[model samples]
Target: LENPPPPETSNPNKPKRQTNQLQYLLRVVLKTLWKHQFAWPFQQPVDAVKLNLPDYYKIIKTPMDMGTIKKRLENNYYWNAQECIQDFNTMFTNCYIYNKPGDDIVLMAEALEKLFLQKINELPTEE
Candidate 1:
C-alpha cells in the first residue's frame, strides 16, 4: 500500500508559538466567577459542592473543554460572556470588535481574567 501523505503545514510566516497567557489569566477569573455564581449550590448544607480538588479541576476544565477559553498559558485563547460585558465599553470603539467577534471577545475575556486574578491573589490560598 502507498504511504499516507504528510499533514499540511501552516504558513511559515505566521506566528507559530501558541502562547495564551491572557487566556490562562482569564481562566483564573472565570473560576472565581463560577465559585460565586454557583455559591447557592455550596450554601446547601445537604448538597453543598465542596470546594475540593475534584471541584477545582472540574471548574477549570469546564471552560477549557467547552472551548470558551484557553486552559493553559500555551494554547489558543477562548472567552466567556462575563469578560465581554466587562470590556464592552472599550470593545465597542474597536473595528476588530465588529469584524472578528470571536477573537476580540477572547481578549476581553483575558482582560477580565487578569482583573479576577488580581483580586484572587490578594486572598489567602489555603483554608
Candidate 2:
C-alpha cells in the first residue's frame, strides 16, 4: 500500500497572525544588522563616482543596500522571510563580484552574511 502523506505535513489550523510576529522579528534582525560595525559599506547605495569605480553600475544590474532593504521591510515588500534573504544575498553577491578575493569590503560582507544567517535561523518556522 502507498504510504499516506503525513497529516502533520501542513497545519491548516495555524493562525494568520503569525505573519505579524514574523515581520516583528524581521525588523529586529534588520536593526541589529544595521548597527553592526561591518554595516557601514552597505548602509546606503554605493557611490561609484565617488569611489572612482566607473564600471560599478555596469557590472551590478541590481544594486541593493541595507537602507533599501530596511525601507522595503518597513513597507512590507516581502511576503516571506525568503524574499528578504534574497535581497541580502543580492547585496552580498554584488560586493563579492565587484571586489577581489581577500578584499576588506568582501571580508566584511562575509562576516555580515554569517551573522545574517545565524539571526534568520532563529526565526519561527513556517509550519
Candidate 3:
C-alpha cells in the first residue's frame, strides 16, 4: 500500500495573552515619570522649572524585569525612563532658579524632556 497521507493539521483560534505584569508595571512607572517631567512644575517648554521628588520605589518588591528595559535602553542609547526621572529629580534639587542668569533652566528642561520622550517611545508595544 502507498504511504498514508500525513495527518491533517488542525486550526485553533486562541486569544493572545496579555502583556506581562512586569511590562505593565514598567509602563506605569514610565508614564508617571513622563507626567512629572513634562507636564508638571511648569507646562511651557520655554518656561518650565524642575522640581525634586522623593526617590522612586517600585510598588512590588521583586526586581524589575530588566530584559525589556535593557533592550529599550540599548536601542535608544539615551537616558532610560528611570535614569531620566532620576536626573530630573537631581537637577531640580541642585540647579538654580530659572530667573537667575546663566541658569538655562529652559534649555536643561528641554533636553531632559527630549531624552525622556525618546526613551518612552522606544519601548515595545503590547503584542
Candidate 4:
C-alpha cells in the first residue's frame, strides 16, 4: 500500500546470479519483500517448524556428515503417498530434501518419517 517496486536489480543478459544465496531467499531480498511489505497477512506459507528442531550439528553422528548437504530439497509431493515412498521406501533414512514453500516443511530422512507418519505411529489398538 505504500510504494511501487524497484526495477530488476541486474541485467538479465549478464551471467546469472552466482552467489550462495538460495533462489527463494533471493526472491525476497530482491522483489517480494517490497510487494509484501504493504500487503496483509494470510493463512499459509505453511507456518513454523512443527517440531523441536535440534541445532543442525547436534543430530548427526559425524561432523563430516554435517559438511555435506545433498543439495535439493527443492521439490514437493502433493499427496502423502508420494512423500511416503520417497522417505519411507528404504525402511531406513531418506536423504532427499523435502522442503516446500506452500507447507514450509524442511523434513528429510528419519525426520520426515516422524513428521508425516506420526499419526499411524500413534494409533491405539481400539481404533
Instruction: Return the top candidate by TM-score.
Output: 2
**Model 3 clash number:** 0
In model 1, the clashing pairs are 26-113, 68-79, 69-78
Stretches > 4 Å off in candidate 1: 1-61, 64-102
How close is each model in CA RMSD to the real structure? 16.4, 12.9, 20.5, 17.9
For residues 42-96, what per-residue lDDT tens digits would candidate 2 score against the true structure? 9888877667777887778778888877766655566676767888899999999
lDDT of each: 0.34, 0.74, 0.37, 0.26
Runs in model 4 lying further than 4 Å from the true structure? 1-107, 123-127
Candidate 2 off by > 4 Å: 1-25
TM-score of 4: 0.17
- Candidate 4 per-residue C-alpha lDDT over 54-84 given as tens digits, one digit per residue, 9 for 90 to 100: 4322332222111011111122211232322
TM-score of each: 0.22, 0.78, 0.24, 0.17
Report the alpha-carbon TM-score of model 3 versus the true structure.
0.24
**Please, what's the RMSD in Å of model 3?**
20.5
Error of 2 at 18 (Å): 8.6
Clashing pairs for predicted structure model 3, backbone only: none
Better of 2 and 4 by lDDT: 2
Q: How many clashes does each candidate structure show, in the order listed?
A: 3, 0, 0, 0
* Candidate 3 lDDT trough over 10 residues, lowest sum: 56-65
Candidate 2: worst-modelled 10 consecutive residues by lDDT: 1-10
Q: Candidate 1 on 21-118: residue-level lDDT in tens?
A: 34434455445554553223222111113333243322221112211222222232223333323332232233232335557545554554455557
